[PDB]
User: Fold SET domain-containing protein 7 from Homo sapiens.
Amino acid sequence: GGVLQGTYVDGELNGPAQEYDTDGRLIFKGQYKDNIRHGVCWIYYPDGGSLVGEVNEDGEMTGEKIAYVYPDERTALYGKFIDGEMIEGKLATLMSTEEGRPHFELMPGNSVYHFDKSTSSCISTNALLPDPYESERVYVAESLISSAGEGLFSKVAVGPNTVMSFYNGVRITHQEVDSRDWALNGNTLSLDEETVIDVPEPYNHVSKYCASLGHKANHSFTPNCIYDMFVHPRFGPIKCIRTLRAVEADEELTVAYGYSPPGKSGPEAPEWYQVELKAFQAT
Ligand SMILES: C[S@@+](CC[C@H](N)C(=O)[O-])C[C@H]1O[C@@H](n2cnc3c(N)ncnc32)[C@H](O)[C@@H]1O
Assistant:
């Protein structure tokens, strides 16, 4: 599936090439040499992020100068990667692109980021190491909504379809979430058919966990954001918060929580939600 526009020299791929996904989105741009990815290549993710760097002998993203670039196409985690996996990335800025080749400038400080996919019990190896892309776009504060605890706010004005925050957390089964005390489900977010993401009790406090902040976004029936899929260099496959339209600086980010046909919709919706739902219906 999907098209691969290539340059061939006697049977094998040799020269520039560009690949697209079934949807016609550019997922790869670079070149091949004897049917193998060669030189500085770019891998583009559906969510807007990407991988770029001097590929190795086997055509993979393995090197000491590989980089993951966030959706703003400016914030980057530059460093050591093995076959696309971030082993030791340092915060940097993509200054410019010279003939397809990127130029990175490290940011002050030597914090190291690495692939650290959560487990059912470990949410992160550095719960208090913030996400640099998040630090630029959002902040947590008392929600403008009444009796709704903390909310998530935009630091600057941005347009529609902008990735603002990441929803990372421990990974557990739907079975476990549907069968346990529902009072423990305030932060559960369905990732897919087999995994639910949760930011369990202790970590729901910014003073204990600030690696991602998506779980701080409150609900609204007229939301300005939606939950979207995201492949993070550090968190791995998770969900993120993306704007549905332009948002002002200091505007509160909200999303419509998921509450399918009767029965096949899992646990009942919280009391606060049901209340607002009625108040909303025929507002
Ligand atoms: C995913 S958290 C969002 C952040 C949370 N308010 C906090 O301070 O950490 C979900 C919880 O926030 C509250 N919440 C979200 N949207 C709300 C709303 N519209 N009205 C009241 N409470 C809301 C309730 O306790 C709820 O279960």
Observations:
- Residues 151 and 216 are 5 Å apart (CA to CA).
